[PDB]
Design a binder for this molecule. Structure first.
Ligand code: CLA
Ligand code: CLA
Ligand code: CLA
Ligand code: CLA
Ligand code: CLA
Ligand code: CLA
Ligand code: CLA
Ligand code: CLA
Ligand SMILES: CC1=C(C#C/C(C)=C/C=C/C(C)=C/C=C/C=C(C)/C=C/C=C(\C)C#CC2=C(C)C[C@@H](O)CC2(C)C)C(C)(C)C[C@H](O)C1
Ligand SMILES: CC1=CCCC(C)(C)[C@H]1/C=C/C(C)=C/C=C/C(C)=C/C=C/C=C(C)/C=C/C=C(C)/C=C/C1=C(C)CCCC1(C)C
Ligand SMILES: CC1=C(C/C=C(\C)CCC[C@H](C)CCC[C@H](C)CCCC(C)C)C(=O)c2ccccc2C1=O
Lengths: 30, 90, 107, 34, 108, 732, 162, 101
């Protein structure tokens, strides 16, 4: 099974992906 | 709409004559038509022989016969090159 | 309450005579749902002979109407002032068409 | 389920707050002259 | 013609109101029945939409013979109430009761 | 007044049309104000990185939700009895009967049962626990971030590629054939040889031990000797129990042919040897083109030299290289046509030759996967023709293409359209005529007068591959043939068993019903092609609008003059062909699903007898299989098929709502909206609130698009509910 | 847009700092409060029969939110309603969350503001930065040590609370 | 005050928790949720519809709209709270007048 801490590691990496998605979207938007 | 690049050494290959210019043969532009015709017949016989020797394919085949069987499709391109050179006076 | 009304019979051509189903009363045909049988029984018809006389009466009226349409366009066409009589037309269509029609049917 | 409190936290936020916030800010952005 | 905007805007509003409050009752019931919530439905068992005016008019027509049509012997139609008429063991006519489903399809 | 920042004509529209049109034109970067070609190619590159990251996030999410909430570890123990879980349900609108009814899967919470097949795919490639599903989800999350960063980076001023880089076709082709196609096929062969096959044989191999566990006992020494056949020795026995050591062999590269007898799937060593050979062939293919060292081919020279000397193709392919490199729509049309053919091959070859262990015993997954990839195929195939029409309108230059293959296509477009019209009518008249003939004759009680054509050509092709069911005795079916004897040592023993067992979907038996439905499919393909081809070839001009190219791809009409010109644009032929694509994939998936559910009961004769007239399709397929679906809830309760039962009705609603946009047009709605604008301005307490954008009716083209979206969505949702719920409810 | 005092501004810095100081107080208070068992029926699991499907949690045992979580949530719902009413209809003197956009921004403090021991803006900003830092510190400390946040607060403060 | 007062009643009588003893609590909180969503609607209307000028005594000005929104939120929560108090205490209001029969 998966522990909650492992879920929290997944949420941290998905947050980092959200920040990079915003920065790419703003670069595309100019 | 913008210049389309092609590699260095790109030349004009459009032909409206009986045969294309010998430039269409690439590195084989200087080979004579007699040499292509004889190489084509040689490659066809060796390729057909090697192909015939391995038609019942088994788990362990002779590797050289496999490589030699590739000469049959190569011979088609060789006799096309022989027709091109003979009609270019080479 | 047992026989199913049927007044349409098909010809046997391409297997289509399967449509002549067993409606009852020693008969085969297409079951009809227009309620004509109940109209005729309410009228008191009780026989096919009187239905032949009604069919002839319809044919005679049909000939008289097509004659009248020809006659009133090609021989005797009313002028516009005849058609522009709304009071006269209503008097005749209420009293004459509806009232006499109801009275004759009541008789 | 492990961390079973998470659907009961995240589903109302994602399903109600996230669209309510993007509708509000998209509405403001698309109706500004400058 | 000189107030056709007021006519078409009020008719348009009536059609929107009446589509929401007739067909949306059906959509509410499909959703509740699908969700397992049969007590949250518009039905006879659950929340009731009763056609009280039509039921009352049916009562009046069943009471009419001998009362407000005194020389009548029977009702104008057995659909309003009364006996079951059977001919050849098949029902000719019998009272057509109105419930929540009848309210909903009448507003449809 | 500033939302369509890419369009000054839309940002000054004072109506609600500005919002709609600004959203629908956002990704058409060529039409945006002040777009150069440099900036166009760089934005396409970055938004391709963003799309790639979206795909990796979707895959990581599916892996995460299965690792967290699924029963992968219970399913892996007993894969034919356990039903895979997709994700858990948390819906505060549920009642307690609904919460209880969806609590399947052996868990204590409501769940969706997965129809995607990801359990069988992850099981076959090695995954055994929840923790390596979770490790894979974290890897894809990292890769998604890396590609988001790469997209942002290549928009920075020093890292913005030039147009000369973007149009270096030769280098891209070399790298994409030998690295993206070839090397990754070789690396996937490595994964199967090193991980998937050992874990199919009970031995765990992961990142913690894979450098000290040899895939083969001999181990990379027969490869370096030419004794390659030592890797095919001792394959998995027919007694092998997948995932365990019992019956397992030691071979890693075999060519057995046929199916693993217990998983009913292709052998993993065949799949590994397939990817090794594909990898080598594609790496060889990727050395064809000249980049920097003087060997290889110029693409421009090959296109220029292929003019047949008889002159039947005109100038041949001279000038085609310039047009293709310059036009991105021509590239899109080729890519989409090519991709559409593959996803149709994916749909056809994965139901007949399944690769995943224990798949093909899951009927819902097989039905969902076939239907999904055929619908994707039909969309890709429509899009290829749409972007070919956009190519002709927008990117095609007649003076750089004098007497090409392209110009000569436009020179005999009337012949192609007229012949396509003939073949479609020839197929349509007679396929509908034979179907209606059979219907009347069966209805009149005489099925022996039906016109039942045996599909002998396809049966002969089946017999040529070894099917011994029609007595044709040709090629592989003939025991003493040159074809049968050549392959007797390798594939023929396993393949003959696979194709001559009536327990799989390899070359399913066919009869008159299959003949009639194949002709209907052919009619649908020709008619969809006719509208798309007519749209592409008449895109530049016609007799009604000879200057149609000056107006673009999507315009409403040319007005009521010249007899009327509604639906005259090339976009409108995309619009009209979308209905025919939906009809075509409908006939294909109805055929696949009815033939498969009747075989899965053991009642193939029900398809054989009822498929030759249309009432058999109406009562024995749609009406008969509707009953478990429409009883998902009723006045007596509900079960877990209630959600599909709701989606079914949902699909019927959207589809019908599409009719409103397609049948009723703009002038009516604009006059209604003007009476509502009056009413708002005159109503007290409500006229305190004012619109910033003037309410207008939708445009002519927008309404066609809105009706098409509603129609298509209703089509997809209705069929998805039926194909999943009927297969689940029946289980066969 | 973000010219209303939103984003990385000193207004946002001050507002977040005030919330963090209340949050440190609320974390200390709930740790002390559940250490002594002064939250009533803290373990009693709410019934879906009374509260509906919003109470469901899908932990294997009980399948419902506990009363302790519900009570803490209602406490924060009290201060959220006050928060919304103060954001949209603030007091006459109260510092506003959203600025006019024609306002002049407060000068950024820097590394440490001038030390003013009164009921000042400098003291408020110093304590707010310190409390936000405390929020992150307690979260990360609890995550790595493996202990719960309430027990972590008790150990960090030296088991005064329980 | 007017709108908040009548909002409580439909949520309480016809909501999902209507047959529970938390029906009035759920109805008030549902009224509160609608109030908060509507105040968000009023605020965004004010942001996008009015330019900033000093005039504050008219409804259709930026400050006048912000004042109206402030007052509407306070009065709405006040009227919903008053309706909660009245229904909580008076058994006539808890039924539809059905306590008399
Ligand atoms: C008593 C007088 C009388 C009667 C019965 C009618 C009857 C009719 N008129 Mg009218 N009409 C009348 C006077 C009358 N009209 C006058 C005075 C005017 C001038 C203002 C018009 C002007 C007028 C116009 C302009 C039109 C009619 C039309 C019609 C026909 C309506 C369609 C219909 O229901 O026919 C079907 C019902 C029937 C019962 C068919 C009956 C056919 C005959 C003609 C009825 C009378 C037969 C006879 C009196 C009965 C003898 C009974 C005997 C056996 C005891 C109907 C036949 C319309 C029409 O269809 O024209 C042909 C039409 O366009 N009428
Ligand atoms: C039907 C396919 C086909 C045909 C007709 C050709 C034809 C040719 N190739 Mg190509 N080639 C092909 C497939 C083909 N190739 C593939 C699949 C590959 C990838 C392995 C290559 C890779 C390749 C290279 C790397 C080179 C050629 C070269 C040549 C030319 C050599 C003539 C010769 O050997 O003189 C005797 C000739 C024009 C050479 C050349 O000069 O190209 C212009 C060269 O350097 N070929
Ligand atoms: C997308 C996800 C989603 C979620 C999680 C919910 C959640 C809920 N809905 Mg549903 N709803 C949704 C979408 C959703 N809705 C959609 C798309 C529609 C339109 C078809 C509806 C239509 C709908 C109706 C018609 C009803 C619900 C009801 C409910 C409540 C469940 C019943 C209950 O226990 O009563 C307990 C519920 C409460 C005690 C009230 C909760 C009030 C919230 C918590 C206040 C929040 C403040 C507000 C959101 C501020 C946000 C501003 C903005 C940024 C969003 C629950 C709050 C019922 C309801 O309102 O219950 C009263 C109800 O009658 N829903
Ligand atoms: C299923 C198909 C369908 C549907 C739903 C509609 C719907 C409608 N039509 Mg259309 N129409 C259709 C087919 C359909 N039509 C076709 C085929 C034609 C071809 C000739 C037309 C031609 C036509 C004309 C010519 C006219 C209409 C009018 C109307 C409206 C009637 C007023 C009304 O009921 O409002 C209430 C809306 C509904 C009942 C729609 C369903 C909504 C239900 C209750 C669910 C709501 C869900 C909710 C919004 C979800 C919110 C959350 C979500 C956003 C997440 C309504 C918008 C008339 C109109 O506009 O007058 C007012 C009108 O003049 N229609
Ligand atoms: C990899 C595939 C691919 C790519 C890159 C594109 C890209 C594009 N297409 Mg093509 N298209 C595709 C697949 C693809 N499409 C398929 C599969 C279909 C069939 C359904 C179509 C059918 C199609 C048509 C009919 C049209 C486009 C148009 C467009 C352009 C604008 C899209 C837009 O603004 O909507 C963005 C929409 C949103 C952001 C809202 C959601 C853009 C260049 C349009 C265009 O501008 O042509 C000139 C146009 O009219 N495409
Ligand atoms: C059941 C529905 C249906 C049917 C039968 C058709 C049929 C046809 N469509 Mg249409 N179409 C439909 C729905 C339908 N479409 C829809 C919903 C759309 C989306 C808008 C389209 C869009 C569309 C386009 C865009 C195109 C077609 C084309 C075609 C033709 C393609 C098949 C073919 O070539 O030969 C099949 C021929 C037939 C089915 C004709 C039937 C034979 C008849 C019934 C003879 C009977 C005579 C009878 C005695 C008459 C009785 C009269 C009575 C008063 C006595 C054909 C006329 C294409 C075309 O015209 O190709 C040339 C084309 O370009 N259709
Ligand atoms: C343009 C018409 C057309 C098209 C698109 C197709 C398409 C197809 N056919 Mg059909 N077929 C046709 C006409 C057509 N056929 C005719 C007229 C016959 C004779 C009755 C058949 C008999 C037939 C059989 C027996 C089988 C197929 C099958 C198939 C499929 C595989 C490909 C194949 O075998 O091609 C077949 C292609 C042809 C026969 C070429 C036809 C081309 C000409 C122009 C059509 C007209 C010929 C003319 C009227 C006859 C001349 C007069 C003669 C009587 C003296 C595919 C769906 C096979 C399949 O997979 O079934 C499931 C299969 O087994 N077809
Ligand atoms: C919120 C303010 C606050 C308060 C009132 C206290 C008070 C106390 N802490 Mg400290 N502590 C604080 C903040 C605080 N601390 C911070 C911010 C941290 C970092 C998370 C710690 C980490 C910490 C540890 C690791 C320990 C204490 C311990 C103690 C207690 C006894 C020994 C002592 O004087 O430690 C000296 C005071 C300090 C180190 C900080 C002042 C004491 C009553 C000890 C104890 O008894 O734990 C069970 C102990 O071992 N504290
Ligand atoms: C703690 C807590 C809460 C809270 C809170 C808040 C506002 C917490 C905010 C924390 C923030 C904004 C921390 C910012 C950190 C950035 C750093 C250290 C980088 C510097 C370079 C609330 C008020 C919800 C109550 C809750 O019962 C407990
Ligand atoms: C369509 C689209 C539009 C424009 C173009 C485009 C950009 C290319 C494209 C891309 C769109 C893309 C790619 C969109 C991608 C969107 C993504 C990846 C969104 C991810 C959101 C994750 C969140 C909010 C998790 C937060 C977790 C938290 C705060 C947990 C924190 C914590 C917990 C409790 C535990 C640990 C400690 C702390 C830190 C305290
Ligand atoms: C109904 C109808 C209208 C009226 C439809 C209108 C005015 C659309 C208004 C619908 C509301 C206002 C918004 C629709 C919201 C949708 C649920 C989706 C919103 C946007 C999402 C994509 C985010 C037309 O204007 C029209 C024009 C030409 C041919 C046919 C028709 C037609 O059939």
């Amino acid at each position: 099974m998966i522990s909650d801490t492992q879920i929290f590691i997944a949420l941290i990496l998905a947050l980092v992906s959200l920040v990079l998605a915003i920065r790419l979207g703003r670069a595309l938007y100019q | 709409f913008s210049p389309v690049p092609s590699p260095e050494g790109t030349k004009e290959t459009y032909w409206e004559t009986k045969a294309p210019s010998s430039d269409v043969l690439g590195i084989g532009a200087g080979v004579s038509s007699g040499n292509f015709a004889a190489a084509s017949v040689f490659a066809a016989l060796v390729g057909g022989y090697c192909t015939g020797q391995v038609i019942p394919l088994t788990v362990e085949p002779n590797p050289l016969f496999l490589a030699g069987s590739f000469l049959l499709p190569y011979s088609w391109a060789l006799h096309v090159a022989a027709w091109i050179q003979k009609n270019n006076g080479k | 309450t047992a026989v199913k009304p049927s007044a349409q019979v098909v010809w046997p051509i391409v297997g289509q005579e399967v449509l002549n189903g067993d409606v009852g009363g020693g008969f085969q045909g297409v079951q009809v749902t227009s309620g004509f049988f109940q109209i005729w029984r309410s009228s008191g018809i009780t026989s096919e002979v009187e239905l032949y006389w009604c069919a002839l009466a319809g044919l005679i009226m049909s000939g008289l109407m097509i004659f009248a349409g020809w006659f009133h366009y090609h021989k005797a066409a009313p002028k516009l002032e005849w058609f522009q009589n709304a009071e006269s037309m209503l008097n005749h269509h209420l009293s004459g068409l509806l009232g006499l029609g109801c009275l004759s049917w009541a008789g | 389920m492990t961390a079973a409190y998470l659907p009961s936290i995240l589903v109302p936020i994602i399903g109600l707050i996230f669209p309510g916030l993007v509708m509000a800010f998209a509405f403001i952005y698309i109706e500004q002259d400058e | 013609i000189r107030h056709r905007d007021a006519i078409i805007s009020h008719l348009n509003w009536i059609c929107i109101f009446l589509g929401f409050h007739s067909f949306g009752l059906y959509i509410h019931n499909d959703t509740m029945r699908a969700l397992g919530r049969t007590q949250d439905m518009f039905s006879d068992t659950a929340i009731q939409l009763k056609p009280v005016f039509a039921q009352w008019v049916q009562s009046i027509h069943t009471l009419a013979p001998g009362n407000t049509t005194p020389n009548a012997l029977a009702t104008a139609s057995y659909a309003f109430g009364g006996d079951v008429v059977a001919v050849g063991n098949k029902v000719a006519m019998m009272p057509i009761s109105l419930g929540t489903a009848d309210f909903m399809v009448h507003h449809i | 007044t500033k939302f369509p920042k890419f369009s000054q004509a839309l940002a000054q529209d004072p109506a609600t049309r500005r919002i709609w049109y600004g959203l629908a034109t956002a990704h058409d970067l060529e039409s945006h104000d002040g777009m150069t070609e440099e900036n166009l190619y760089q934005k396409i590159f970055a938004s391709h990185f963003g799309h790639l990251a979206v795909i990796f996030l979707w895959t990581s999410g599916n892996l995460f939700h299965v690792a967290w909430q699924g029963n992968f570890e219970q399913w892996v123990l007993n894969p034919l009895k356990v039903k895979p879980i997709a994700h858990a349900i948390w819906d505060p609108h549920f009642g307690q009967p609904a919460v209880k009814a969806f609590t399947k899967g052996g868990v204590s919470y409501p769940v969706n049962i997965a129809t995607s097949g990801v359990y069988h795919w992850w099981y076959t490639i090695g995954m055994r626990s929840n923790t390596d599903l979770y490790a894979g989800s974290l890897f894809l999350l990292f890769l998604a971030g890396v590609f988001l960063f790469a997209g942002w980076l290549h928009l920075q001023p020093k890292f913005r590629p030039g147009l000369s880089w973007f149009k270096n076709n030769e280098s891209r082709l070399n790298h994409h054939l030998s690295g993206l196609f070839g090397f990754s096929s070789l690396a996937w062969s490595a994964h199967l040889i090193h991980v998937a096959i050992p874990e199919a044989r009970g031995q765990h191999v992961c990142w913690d031990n894979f450098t000290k566990v040899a895939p083969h006992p001999a181990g990379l020494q027969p490869f370096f000797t030419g004794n390659w056949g030592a890797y095919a020795a001792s394959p998995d026995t027919t007694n092998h129990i997948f995932g365990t050591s019992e019956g397992a062999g030691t071979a890693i590269l075999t060519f057995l042919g046929g199916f693993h007898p217990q998983t009913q799937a292709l052998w993993l060593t065949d799949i590994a040897h397939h990817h090794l050979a594909i990898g080598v062939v594609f790496i060889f293919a990727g050395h064809m083109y000249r980049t920097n060292w003087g060997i290889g081919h110029s693409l421009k020279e090959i296109l220029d030299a292929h003019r047949p000397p008889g002159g039947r193709l005109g100038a041949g392919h001279k000038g085609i290289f310039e047009t293709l490199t310059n036009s991105l729509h021509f590239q899109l049309g080729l890519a989409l046509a090519s991709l559409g053919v593959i996803t149709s091959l994916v749909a056809q070859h994965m139901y007949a030759l399944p690769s995943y262990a224990f798949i093909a015993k899951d009927y819902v997954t097989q039905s969902a996967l076939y239907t999904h990839h055929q619908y994707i195929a039909g969309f890709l195939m429509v899009g290829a023709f749409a972007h070919g029409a956009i190519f002709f309108v927008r990117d095609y230059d007649p003076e750089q293409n004098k007497n090409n293959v392209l110009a000569r296509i436009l020179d005999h477009k009337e012949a192609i359209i007229s012949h396509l019209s003939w073949v479609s009518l020839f197929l349509g008249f007679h396929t509908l005529g034979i179907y209606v003939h059979n219907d009347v004759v069966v209805a009149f009680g005489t099925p022996e007068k039906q016109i039942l054509v045996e599909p002998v050509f396809a049966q002969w092709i089946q017999a040529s591959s070894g099917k011994a069911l029609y007595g044709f005795d040709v090629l592989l079916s003939s025991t003493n043939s040159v074809a049968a004897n050549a392959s007797s040592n390798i594939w023929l023993p396993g393949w003959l068993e696979a194709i001559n067992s009536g327990k799989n979907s390899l070359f399913l038996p066919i009869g008159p019903g299959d003949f009639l439905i194949h002709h209907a499919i052919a009619l649908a393909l020709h008619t969809t092609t006719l509208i798309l081809v007519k749209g592409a070839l008449d895109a530049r001009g016609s007799k009604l609008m000879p200057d149609k190219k000056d107006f673009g791809y999507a315009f409403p009409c040319d007005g009521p003059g010249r007899g009327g010109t509604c639906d005259i644009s090339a976009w409108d032929a995309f619009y009209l062909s979308m209905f025919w694509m939906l009809n075509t994939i409908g006939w294909v998936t109805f055929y696949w699903h009815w033939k498969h559910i009747t075989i899965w009961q053991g009642n193939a004769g029900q398809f054989n007898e009822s498929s030759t007239y249309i009432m058999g399709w109406l009562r024995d397929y749609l009406w008969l299989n509707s009953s478990p679906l429409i009883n998902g809830y009723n006045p007596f309760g509900m079960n877990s098929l209630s959600v599909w039962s709701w989606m079914f009705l949902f699909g019927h609603l959207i589809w019908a709502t599409g009719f409103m946009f397609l049948i009723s047009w703009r002038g009516y709605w604009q006059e209604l909206i003007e009476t509502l604008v009056w009413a708002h301005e005159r109503t007290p307490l409500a006229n305190l609130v004012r619109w910033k954008d003037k309410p207008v009716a939708l445009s002519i083209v927008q309404a066609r698009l809105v009706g098409l979206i509603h129609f298509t969505a209703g089509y997809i949702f209705t069929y998805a509910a039926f194909v999943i719920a009927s297969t689940t409810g029946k289980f066969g | 847009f973000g010219g209303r005092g939103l984003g990385v501004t000193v207004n946002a810095e001050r507002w977040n700092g005030r919330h963090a100081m209340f949050g440190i107080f609320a974390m200390v208070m709930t740790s002390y409060m559940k250490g002594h068992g002064l939250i009533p029926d803290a373990d009693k699991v709410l019934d879906i029969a009374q509260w509906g499907p919003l109470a469901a949690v899908w932990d294997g045992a009980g399948n419902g939110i506990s009363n302790e979580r519900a009570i803490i949530l209602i406490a924060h719902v009290h201060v959220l309603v006050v928060s919304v009413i103060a954001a949209i209809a603030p007091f006459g003197f109260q510092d506003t969350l959203v600025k006019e956009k024609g306002y002049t921004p407060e000068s950024p403090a820097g590394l440490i503001p001038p030390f003013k021991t009164g009921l000042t803006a400098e003291a408020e900003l110093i304590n707010g930065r310190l409390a936000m830092l405390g929020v992150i510190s307690i979260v990360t400390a609890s995550l790595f040590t493996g202990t719960s946040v309430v027990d972590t607060i008790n150990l960090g403060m030296g088991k005064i609370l329980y | 005050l007017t709108h908040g007062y009548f909002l409580v009643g439909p949520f309480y009588k016809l909501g999902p928790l209507r047959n529970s003893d938390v029906a009035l609590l759920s109805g008030f909180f549902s009224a509160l949720g609608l109030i908060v969503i509507l105040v968000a609607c009023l605020t965004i209307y004010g942001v996008v519809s009015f330019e900033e000028t000093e005039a504050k005594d008219q409804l259709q000005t930026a400050k006048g709209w912000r004042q109206f929104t402030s007052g509407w939120l306070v009065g709405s929560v006040g009227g919903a709270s008053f309706a909660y108090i009245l229904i909580s205490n008076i058994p006539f209001l808890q039924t539809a007048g059905m306590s008399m029969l």
